[PDB]
Amino acid sequence: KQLIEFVRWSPERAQHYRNKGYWIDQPLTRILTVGVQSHPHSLAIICGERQLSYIELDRLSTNLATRLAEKGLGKGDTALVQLPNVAEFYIVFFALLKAGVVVLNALYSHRQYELNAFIKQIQPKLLIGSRQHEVFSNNQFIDSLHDVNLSPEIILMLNHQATDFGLLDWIETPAETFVDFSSTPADEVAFFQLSGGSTGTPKLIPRTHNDYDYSVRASAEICGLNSNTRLLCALPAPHNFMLSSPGALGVLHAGGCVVMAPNPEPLNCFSIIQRHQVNMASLVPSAVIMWLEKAAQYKDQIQSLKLLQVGGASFPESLARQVPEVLNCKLQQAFGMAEGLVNYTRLDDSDEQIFTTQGRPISSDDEIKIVDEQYREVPEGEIGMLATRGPYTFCGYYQSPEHNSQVFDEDNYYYSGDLVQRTPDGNLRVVGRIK
Ligand SMILES: Cc1ccc(C(=O)O)c(O)c1
Ligand SMILES: [Ca+2]
Ligand SMILES: [Ca+2]
Ligand SMILES: [Ca+2]
Ligand SMILES: [Ca+2]
């Protein structure tokens, strides 16, 4: 009966974020509902040979939602999803948003240790994975959950076996009966993001409809997405970078099309880029380097690329300058975190800004502090610890009041651990990490 708990923004901040237009109090499904009304037959997802229109995506995720509702899964319930980079991932995502099930998307690279940690934390009644994944190749993991009174009520499986509930079977057919369902309320939790760089298992980050949709809508505008955008999704679909900054969600928000890749391997990616005339991609520096090593041989396959986001790790100026020279597309640098704050270089920034900085916050109401060890602000220019709060930055990890007291100060700034300096033009330079 009780919605998943989380740490709320103050009412004065919530009102402000509504007054500014950031929070519009719509569920994340808004992206899909609006696309369906404006352009139902535009492509939403390209995945191998498949083409999913906006309305196909809408129908398929509604189907799964009705089947989960039929089974008693809804508001108050949680789900663990571990899917590879395929269209089913987004059908499942929009199905759980529609049903009011708070979902944690594990990384496809996560193994038993992490999944066990996640299951113990959110006690999901729904588990969705793939039989092709190492963990579900047999039934030992699924069986172990019973031994700890932690079995889900329902397990759905991609590449299922006969005795399994087939994920595609629950997606292709709506439920026989009708049960009502609805999203969690817009200022309540929609799903769980996962921390990056945390010591042990990644910590759970509750994200509400309001704050996630805002960061999606604002990123989309800042990266110039429109209905012609075709964005390669080669990083892990669940990752904050690939899902929302601007990510698949940002492209759906703009009415465009996401184009799937299993991973960033250059030759397969180059092929997909040529086959579907991909014009945007988002990569971490290690993958950029892999593409740089092969781009000259395949200039022709990747010509249609227009814009590359790069972030997630150190990206020195000398590498950045190769992007336009070798990959033949504009560069956009980003520095974000699944906890909230996302920075982009702007499309009209100077070349020095794009090449030597990681940009500036999405929102004019992102508040930044850069502090020393005595937590006093450093003089402009100097290196400090980054602390931040804003209309899409969380207020605390799930069920972690001890840790939360350590990484938030009295004014509820979040201390991300990143070291940064603010350049004279106003942009940020990510310079290292701190314990
Ligand atoms: C835009 C962006 C870039 C990097 C990350 C990250 O977490 O590494 C992110 O969340 C968002
Ligand atoms: Ca189709
Ligand atoms: Ca639009
Ligand atoms: Ca190009
Ligand atoms: Ca961090």
Backbone angles phi, psi at 97, to 5 degrees: -55, -45
* Whole-angstrom distance, CA of residue 392 vs CA of residue 327: 32
362 Cβ closer than 6 Å to some ligand 1 atom = no
How many other CB atoms are there within 10 angstroms of residue 352's CB atom?
12
Closest CA to 335 of 313, 307, 354: 313
311 Cβ closer than 6 Å to some ligand 1 atom = yes
Burial grade of 109 (CB within 10 A; 0-12, 13-18, 19 or more):
exposed
**Resolved by:** X-ray
- The residues, ordered by sequence, that sit 6+ positions from 428 with a Cβ below 8 Å of its Cβ are 335, 343, 357, 358, 359, 360, 368, 420, 421, 422
Burial grade of 306 (CB within 10 A; 0-12, 13-18, 19 or more):
middle
* Whole-angstrom distance, CA of residue 226 vs CA of residue 38: 13
314 Cα distance to chain centroid: 20
Q: Which CATH class is domain 53-182?
A: alpha beta
Q: How would you write the chain as a 3-class SS string?
A: CCCCCCCCCCHHHHHHHHHCCCCCCCCCCHHHHHHHHHCCCCEEEEECCEEEEHHHHHHHHHHHHHHHHHCCCCCCCEEEECCCCCHHHHHHHHHHHHHCCEEEECCCCCCHHHHHHHHHHHCCCEEEEECCCHHHCCCHHHHHHHHCCCCCCEEEEECCCCCCEEHHHHHHCCCCCCCCCCCCCCCCEEEEEECCCCCCCCCEEEEEHHHHHHHHHHHHHHCCCCCCCEEEECCCCCCHHHHHCCHHHHHHHCCCEEEECCCCCHHHHHHHHHHHCCCEEEECHHHHHHHHHHHHHHCCCCCCCCEEEECCCCCCHHHHCHHHHHHCCEEEEEEECCCCCEEECCCCCCHHHHHHCCCEECCCCCEEEEECCCCCECCCCCCEEEEEECCCCCCCCCCCHHHHHHHECCCCCEEEEEEEEECCCCCEEEEEECC
Closest CA to ligand 1's atom 8: 312
Half-sphere exposure of 107 (CA within 13 A, CB side): 18
- The residues, ordered by sequence, that sit 6+ positions from 321 with a Cβ below 8 Å of its Cβ are 355
* Whole-angstrom distance, CA of residue 278 vs CA of residue 357: 26
Closest CA to 154 of 216, 87, 71: 71
Radius of gyration of the chain (CA): 21
Query: What distance, in Å, lies between the first and last C-alpha atoms of the chain?
Result: 39
* Whole-angstrom distance, CA of residue 240 vs CA of residue 116: 22
Q: Which residue has the tokens 């679909």?
A: 237
CB 53 within 8 A of CB 238: no
Burial grade of 85 (CB within 10 A; 0-12, 13-18, 19 or more):
buried
CA angle 47, 346, 31 (to 5 degrees): 40
Buried b (16+ CB within 10 A) or exposed e, 362-383: bbeebbbbbbeeeeeebeeeee
Q: Which two tokens stand for residue 303?
A: 């010509």
196 Cβ closer than 6 Å to some ligand 1 atom = yes
Q: Which two tokens stand for residue 209?
A: 């409809």
Q: Going edge to edge, which strands form the sheet with 384-389?
A: 367-371, 384-389, 414-422, 428-433
Residues of the chain with CATH 3.40.50.980: 53-182
Closest CA to ligand 1's atom 3: 336
338 Cβ closer than 6 Å to some ligand 1 atom = yes
Q: Going edge to edge, which strands form the sheet with 43-47?
A: 50-53, 43-47, 257-260, 230-233, 280-283, 307-310, 330-336, 342-344, 360-361
Question: Is 83 annotated in some ligand binding site?
Answer: no
Question: How many angstroms separate the Cα of 380 from the Cα of each of 291, 317, 370, 371?
Answer: 36, 22, 9, 10
| Closest ligand 1 atom, residue 196 Cα | 7
Q: Which two tokens stand for residue 192?
A: 């769980």
250 Cβ closer than 6 Å to some ligand 1 atom = no
Beta partners for residue 43, in sequence order: 53
Pocket test for ligand 1, best of 249, 342, 392 (most atoms within 8 A of CB): 342
Burial grade of 42 (CB within 10 A; 0-12, 13-18, 19 or more):
middle
CATH fold of 208-433 reads Rossmann fold (3.40.50)
Residues of the chain with CATH 3.40.50.12780: 208-433
Q: Which two tokens stand for residue 329?
A: 């597309």
